[PDB]
């Protein structure tokens, strides 16, 4: 029974739970790597070794947080648990293929841990640019193990995207149009279309890197007429959509959490929120060379990528102001999930505004490849994707488990993590403006004060991550069983109770047309 | 005894919002004035003042006599 | 949300134990590696 | 130019596929493929909600084009009302043999 | 009935604040951390050449 | 008992065996490229092939033999297949992008010209034009197969499907022969890299497509298809037209414009 | 759309329906408190008389607590509404939440 | 170079850097103000027991919150793109200097007249002379004439690097097989420092750039002496 | 050839509680075990190969 | 462009069989003649050890590491020229 | 003709940040000119301008590799 | 069927809170310790 | 009374100020005296005692508005515990400095810093605003 239920699953809730467990374990790997980074940097000089071991830690930090923590938790964990329930479907369209998307991830993570054990690791940056990642400067198996880890994670998500798009399009009640599905379901659908179109282009690019490393092709080697810059275009053609894939399910959860704890039946401006997510998904494919403003591109190309990148602020601003309009007039319930969502709104807005600074290429010439970029994206990732995840996890934990957390401990955990991440990242803006580069294991002495404070911040967030583990243990150790939940008439995933039976919607909902 | 007067009972949330969005704006214009004054204008004036009578050869000679250069003793 | 009282209440002492074990499970193994870095490096 | 040898669905469909094809031929919808048309929804003329058990979830799109659907369990017994618009629904249980 | 916060909230707030200030002051001032502050108004420049 | 039309699949070992096959194939290629050994890679190819066979066998059991493909299930599988094709089109777009990037702006190492100095392209009017006629013809004959099947004509469905597969095989053997005859190789700079990796993944897909048509041929021989229900044949026909359209773009781009 | 008077008149009529049932009384009050207003005395009086027809003393008390709540920090509103309702409270024998000690935390 | 506790950009050494500082100030106030407007509008939504929970009409307010951001973006983009096309204008350099990136140091070639080239490596910390800056100084500085337009061309002979000097507003990637151009003009003499700005392996943190800006006649005699 | 799909429909619809991947009978069990053994065995071998490859061979 | 062919008003298999045997297979037969007329070996060009060709940055994982996968001795020189 | 050569002037054929083709074209033009002279017995001094421009712009290692490859018979540009 | 309900829809047992504490310590502690041991490994090599 | 996990699909009781009349009564089963008090409620409410009216309220509802909306001392516990664990963090940082970090580079020695500072002033590092601007080159001291 154990093996049939957990290794042979065809059930969306149990596969969802598999992905949340996987994602939590990866989150501890990515946290440790982040503390190794901040230990290296937390005083001047060398702690671990030179930039090779250091950038192996940095590279793995990114890949683990992106591909093994955030994507599995938002799309495989919350998407699998919530999407079928929110549309009254009895499971995903392809329940067995859904289980292979899950099981591709432990092999993909194994490959990445293999890359770091063999030779001297892949110390390439998560962008894996050649020629540093090619077979002369990174001879031996480490970068090929990295490429194959990304191939497996890519197939897992491409097949996941097919599953979600099909389920969302085909498995709603016959009366429900796509304009009567909840915002989280639209956020998963749009993220899945972004995955479907962007991951195959990354697959093409890293396959070309694999053949340049092992079959004597020269796609990116000028000796054969190749160009290292072509790899950058193909990687970033996927990498920009990838950041919107990381955040969109987060925006979908934030809309539900803000609506729910404002005591509202609906988010403000539902069709504006759908329009904003499709516009950000479409615009997110025509901006990628904002990662390439110092590579030597033409001036008119730099002008178009500056303008197109900026334009994304318009639909994004619609959603921020709509979340404010949803709080407007609410019966505000100051639950710990609500705190996470309010931290999200503020910290995402900070990071989006420093993104707007960077979109100006002439200023990005000075800010590129410095810590100002690191500060921009950790305000949207560590203080947007993570805070949306922690919001959704504390909100829906009683649905998944049937048990309640202690809300006082969860508020304490939010307070420690909010201090910790702002201590860590806020000073990196000053380090970036004054010129400290990225991917450095040590810095000129003038940069010491802000690196010291940033490192001290990272330990406060470590204390929060340890306390989170204790808070989950305490809930399972005390077994306070859920009785009633508020607002089920506009939150269908709760209406089958906590946790819902293994099979739900065996008899579909009744929805009439009129 | 005296009756109480009837108070306003309707649109109280909207009235509070109207009042404060305007005070939210008035701050932004009043902060803009200070941030322009304290940082941006100050910078323009620091650069204009520095270069007004700046003598680059005199600056070079001071550096040269302090022994900073490889190319000039 | 409303919920039943705990089926298996975790007293303050028991929370102190779970919190300490949890913090030690992260702190001790990393602490052991970092304490011994000079040893690994000088080889 | 042409001949036969290819089975038809009438000959060879089986299991649920056959059930759905035979029910459709009779104008019946036991597997809930079609959206039900609403009645005027008053207490005299409630929406009739079929079920194989003692309760079924209803979603009420109270006005055309609302994006918010209102969900609630409808139980066997007296008609119940949507808690947003009040339109009435009544469960009609039984079997899987309509 | 009074709950955990009514009975212990004042003590938790006062001791946690006291402890947090004490240990951060000690860490920041007593254990040899080099903050590298600005030399401006602090350092007397010395001949180097 | 459910009263929706969707398929609750029985719990299955194939997703796990497919996932492990992928670990064995990729760790296998790593051992082949770096540790001089093919062992792990043949174990992974074998288990990948076993997994595909049993999984798709099970889909035929579930559909043809157990009746779980109601119209709602079939409509999902339509979307699934269209989305899969779209992702394969984007995978080839990355190779076309690499081709045009390198050929539109040839660097000094190549002679600052396309084709590079020292490269002698195949003549596009010879075996490449033949391969074009072969795949176009096979798009006509699969269309005949589809109409015969809808018209309930078993014999002409099989005759047209066999013709389509024979042409698939003819293209594959013609390509294998052109690869052997070609005076440039995958190591001949970015011209050989683009040429062989883009036409080589296309050839892999012609092999996959042809395999899928052969599966449809044996299922048709076994009477699995009805004149109205035959999604496996439709999906293989859609994949086959995709392989033909990709060839047309490769022929115009790499063989013709790039000669 | 409508004037404040027309809005008020529609709610007075809603609650004045002689055979209003329990479901309709609760739907009406739980809908009305969603609006940006504290209901006029004349609406509350009609809801309280509906409580009487429905033999529900406790819901009449809860309605007076929701008036107080809807006023938020405008502490002058509730004492004014209780003033305006005193004739009806005395006629129906409705004690206020304060007279019952139900304002004590 | 940066100094301890620094918050903003290094002071401007070139007119283009000056322009960037003023454009940054213009942009940051916006950033300030939007951040502040949001934080504030947020705390306004969260500080009242009054409620209004029924459906709210969105069309009017969405016009405000699409059009006002669009105007703000245009107010940032106008000066932004003016600077972009300014830096791109033709300027007639007096000298061309090449730099090639390597693992891990830079070489410099000044080949307008003679064959002058040399390598430039970080001074190891154990060999710094008193007063010299840890990880910043180099053995052989890139001497250049002040107050003159200089064309720098940048490339690499191995992996990617990127050649940066923050106080001149410069960062140009160093890509093998490619020759990227930038211009450089210092308003003042002095020593202007930068650091390799694309991850390039084990000693990426330790291959800095130091420009030494002096009068033309000093530069000429230094050039002759370096042959 | 003859159309024996009705035969297979009876085989795969028999009420024997078998999952579909074992419902064809004992040959399914054999092919399942062969596949699972090669997958788990190969996975152990791949871990051995990581062990080997994690250390210098000098 | 309609093509130059031309029909409808009924449908399906019969027409697509007519296109298969009347247009598609004929075209394949014609191209097959065209190819098997320009077939047979062309005189290979002088070997020149161009540095953008015969790339070797890592030995191939088969053979002696220096031969491409479908190496043809007649027309594929090694980095040191044609085989003996 | 135009001595007091300081460095290579702006060339509208190559107005963007990538100057690779500027170096290559001048290198070709020089060597093409020098072949055209010498051959026809005329004077290589007329090719001087291309020489000064490519020496200014081209990395030493590119010039050195291209000169090695001309000597080896493996230079892929047409001269 | 399978077990349903709180504590039964998970691949780990919560029947005893101390055995659970041990399993959660092993699970999250192994993920957090791994990169420190990998770094130790890369340092010991050379 | 007693809410069971198995009643999740039934209408339920809730105290919240925005849904004042919940879907069921707080107590539905009545004792003999409670049945007599519900009959008495059919007559004039002026004849109910204050206790009877409170008993009827508490059969229909669990908490009053004043009760359900009460403020609490939880913030003291949250802020104090957060300070505690931020304080615990500085123990970790003390431990790391003592056992993990070695001596930082010799360029941070007081005499090095004084010499480096004068050399920064001699090269006029940031002379417009950031560094040398704050030095008085006439009086040879930091500007006031
Ligand atoms: C969640 C992921 C996410 C999001 C949403 C964004 C959003 C934006 N980002 Fe960024 N970005 C990253 C993740 C993301 N980014 C990552 C991961 C990298 C680098 C990774 C690496 O290099 O390793 C990066 C790098 C990056 C760069 C390259 C910097 C460089 O490397 O030199 C640039 C430059 O244009 C940029 C710009 C922006 C802009 C303009 C936005 C805007 O879309 C933000 C829009 C949002 C707001 C402005 C806030 C809310 C809006 C309002 C309140 C409306 C009104 C306001 C205005 C009209 C201004 N980002
Ligand atoms: C009709 C053609 C069909 C191809 C059949 C031939 C063998 C392999 C089949 C797979 C083809 C797929 C493309 C992979 C890349 C290279 C093969 C290109 C096609 C080919 O076969 O190229 C040959 C070279 O093959 C070589 O190196 C061969 C090296 C063989 C190893 C393949 C390497 C592994 C590829 C990794 C794939 C990763 C894919 C990721 C999926 C993405 C996830 C979303 C050309 O021979 P040549 O002697 O150089 O020149 C001819 C001279 N007379
Ligand atoms: C670049 C930066 C941009 C920043 C932009 C910020 C813009 C702020 C704009 C202000 C909007 C003004 C609306 C005030 C609403 C507050 C609550 C309220 O006051 O509720 C009511 C308003 O709601 C109605 O219906 C009318 C509309 C429906 C409900 C209310 C909708 C508006 C709420 C929007 C709140 C925005 C809050 C945060 C913004 C970031 C008031 O009652 P009425 O007299 O109309 O009833 C009469 C009944 N009728 C309709 C039948 C006639
Ligand atoms: C980046 C995340 C980690 C952050 C901080 C970790 C905080 C430290 C937890 C303590 O870890 C332990 O510390 C002891 C020292 O206090 C070590 O004992 C060492 O030192 C003792 C005292 O010198 C000897 O008795 C022991 O044998 C010797 O192992 C011990 O191995 C290590 O587990
Ligand atoms: C449950 C079923 C699935 C599990 C199967 C597990 C299989 C384990 C067998 C592997 O052993 C072999 O050892 C060979 C000989 O020792 C190796 O050849 C390698 O090493 C040789 C000796 O140095 C070289 O000569 C070879 O060329 C080189 O390929 C090669 O790695 C591998 O074939
Ligand atoms: C044996 C069978 C009669 C088919 C049936 O059971 O109806 C016939 C019908 C169509 C025939 C096939 C088609 O005519 C196409 C092919 C023609 C080749 O000459 C023989 C193999 C070939 C693939 C045929 C084999 C066999 O004779 C088939 C399969
Ligand atoms: Cu060179 Cu980084
Ligand atoms: Mg860069
Ligand atoms: Na360091
Ligand atoms: Zn309704």
Author numbering:
A (entry chain A): 1 to 514
B (entry chain I): 1 to 73
C (entry chain M): 1 to 43
D (entry chain F): 1 to 98
E (entry chain K): 6 to 54
F (entry chain C): 3 to 261
G (entry chain E): 5 to 109
H (entry chain B): 1 to 227
The article reads:
5 is the terminal oxidase of cellular respiration that reduces O2 to water, coupled with a proton-pumping process. The enzyme includes two redox-active metal sites as the low-potential sites (heme a (Fea) and CuA). These sites donate electrons to the O2 reduction site that comprises two high potential metal sites (heme a3 (Fea3) and CuB). The third proton-conducting pathway, the H-pathway, extends for proton pumping from the N-side surface to the P-side surface.
Complete saturation of the azide-binding metal sites is not attained by exposure of CcO to 20 mm azide for 2 days, whereas elongation of the exposure time up to 4 days does not significantly change the X-ray crystal structures. As typically shown in the results obtained by a 2-day exposure to 20 mm azide, the process of azide binding to the metal sites does not tightly synchronize with the progress of the structural changes in the heme a3 and helix X. The azide saturation period was found to be somewhat dependent on the CcO preparation batch. Thus, in contrast to the binding kinetics for the second (low affinity) azide-binding site in solution (faster than the time scale of minutes), 3 days of exposure at 4 °C is necessary for saturation of the two terminal azide-binding sites. The discrepancy is likely to be due to restriction of flexibility in the O2 transfer pathway induced by the crystal packing.
